[PDB]
Scaffold this motif. Structure first.
Motif, mmCIF file in Angstrom:
data_model
loop_
_atom_site.group_PDB
_atom_site.id
_atom_site.type_symbol
_atom_site.label_atom_id
_atom_site.label_comp_id
_atom_site.label_asym_id
_atom_site.label_seq_id
_atom_site.Cartn_x
_atom_site.Cartn_y
_atom_site.Cartn_z
ATOM 1 N N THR A 8 0.818 -1.227 0.000
ATOM 2 C CA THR A 8 0.000 0.000 0.000
ATOM 3 C C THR A 8 0.843 1.264 0.000
ATOM 4 N N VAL A 12 -1.305 3.442 7.273
ATOM 5 C CA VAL A 12 -2.643 3.205 7.833
ATOM 6 C C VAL A 12 -3.443 2.177 6.996
ATOM 7 N N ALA A 13 -3.373 2.323 5.666
ATOM 8 C CA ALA A 13 -4.099 1.462 4.724
ATOM 9 C C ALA A 13 -3.516 0.062 4.709
ATOM 10 N N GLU A 16 -4.775 -1.769 7.987
ATOM 11 C CA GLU A 16 -6.088 -2.268 7.679
ATOM 12 C C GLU A 16 -6.028 -3.530 6.863
ATOM 13 N N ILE A 65 -10.159 2.309 2.275
ATOM 14 C CA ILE A 65 -9.671 3.522 2.931
ATOM 15 C C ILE A 65 -8.398 4.135 2.331
ATOM 16 N N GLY A 66 -7.747 3.418 1.420
ATOM 17 C CA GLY A 66 -6.440 3.817 0.904
ATOM 18 C C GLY A 66 -6.165 3.182 -0.444
ATOM 19 N N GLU A 67 -4.893 3.203 -0.845
ATOM 20 C CA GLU A 67 -4.480 2.662 -2.139
ATOM 21 C C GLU A 67 -3.700 1.364 -1.983
ATOM 22 N N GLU B 7 -2.760 9.625 9.514
ATOM 23 C CA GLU B 7 -1.571 9.695 8.688
ATOM 24 C C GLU B 7 -1.616 10.995 7.904
ATOM 25 N N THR B 41 2.459 8.902 10.615
ATOM 26 C CA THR B 41 1.212 8.401 11.229
ATOM 27 C C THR B 41 1.305 8.521 12.732
ATOM 28 N N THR B 70 -4.830 9.668 5.521
ATOM 29 C CA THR B 70 -5.760 8.613 5.908
ATOM 30 C C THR B 70 -6.025 8.813 7.376
ATOM 31 N N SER B 71 -7.226 8.478 7.816
ATOM 32 C CA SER B 71 -7.506 8.236 9.228
ATOM 33 C C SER B 71 -8.312 6.936 9.359
ATOM 34 N N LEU B 72 -8.212 6.276 10.510
ATOM 35 C CA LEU B 72 -8.881 5.005 10.711
ATOM 36 C C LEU B 72 -9.136 4.736 12.186
#
Lengths: 86, 86, 86, 86, 86, 86
Positions: A8, A12-13, A16, A65-67, B7, B41, B70-72
């Motif tokens: 990713t 963060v992504a 997850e 939520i991300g890439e 992040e 992050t 990003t946030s999670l």
């Protein structure tokens, strides 16, 4: 045993990806690794069906939520590989 | 307990995320981590309502001054995750 | 002995390069290395025909899933090189 | 006490930020930190008026020669923050 | 003695620079170094004619497969430099 | 004493900056430092006229072969700065 990888942009992504992988099937999280440029990889180990299932779910949820940059299942990594990752 | 992550591009906007998170609800700051490419992050731990509230406020205020990428919130990270972050 | 190198954007596409290299011919995986910017290199050592064959297959399969940036076979690296890599 | 941060593209423009901060008011330089991508942050600590004044002057002069990305004053960082930075 | 430097995008194209340098004339390879952003430098030391010849050949062949960013010969680096590189 | 800084894209163009600085006037090379993104800084110390002269020549010659991003002379860095660089 087999190897599942989700790479990713951003940590963060990836976290997850990792979380959803371990929940979704019987895989143990090996670790993560980044190679700069925002690229972070989560790696898990399990039987091939279990790993295949984690990565499917890992990718579904990280993308949420991300890439997700790349994902892969290697059902039986050359032994040399298995040495290097763990 | 739960996990909140914000992040950012750049450290300063992260430090604000972090500060505003800890002020806004009962969470302890775990740490920060960058994965290159400007991506940093901030991670906190608390009950899910407390963590949800920090991230809402963390993001509000980091965005005020910088870029939130990003946030999670993970309300219950797989145990494997909780090992890796702490 | 000879030296085979595949450099990729991203680790996962490198791990595939590496895996497919070691499967495809009699080479031992030396390691990987990243130089930031997403650039990761997998390096193997073997006889020149064995190394040439790994890289052909390493590149075929890494490209399948990711971006191969450079690949190279050095059939007999200057001794100085062989010291640096290993 | 309070916290002043100036984040720049490039170290030299940061060193200027830092220099001009410490000259301009009664703050002690904590350190710098980079998070890749050319992003470097200078951090100082002092009373809020002293810190506010450094950052104003730090930014004025770093911008003179380079790119100021973010600047911030946190008048009272959550204790958790103050632990992380120092 | 003199100093020859070839800086590339990516490690593989650097390893070729290096290899071709050591083959092409009487120079010893000092090392390599990367400064992020894909930028990797190979450095050799020798008499100025020997070093000049390596770099000419180093650049010819690295460019063949990759991107040469900078090359340089310093026939007599300030002593301070020679301390820092080795 | 004073502080001269030349920041470049790439190490080779920095090494030239450094070399030409130390040749051009009575300055001692402190070191270099990179902050990712290809950004590398050469730092020297001397009297202000000596430092001013190095940086002029350092920049002239590094630009000759590469990209000078920022250059700076601080004639008397706050003491805090002088602690951090050396």
């Amino acid at each position: 045993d087999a190897l599942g990888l989700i790479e990713t942009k951003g940590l963060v992504a990836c976290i997850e990806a990792a979380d959803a992988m371990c929940k979704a099937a019987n895989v143990e999280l090996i670790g993560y690794e980044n190679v700069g440029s925002g690229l972070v990889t989560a790696m898990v180990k399990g039987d091939v069906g279990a790993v295949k299932a984690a990565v499917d779910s890992g990718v579904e949820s990280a993308q949420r939520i991300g890439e997700v940059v790349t994902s892969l299942v290697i059902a039986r990594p050359h032994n040399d590989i298995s040495k290097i990752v763990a």
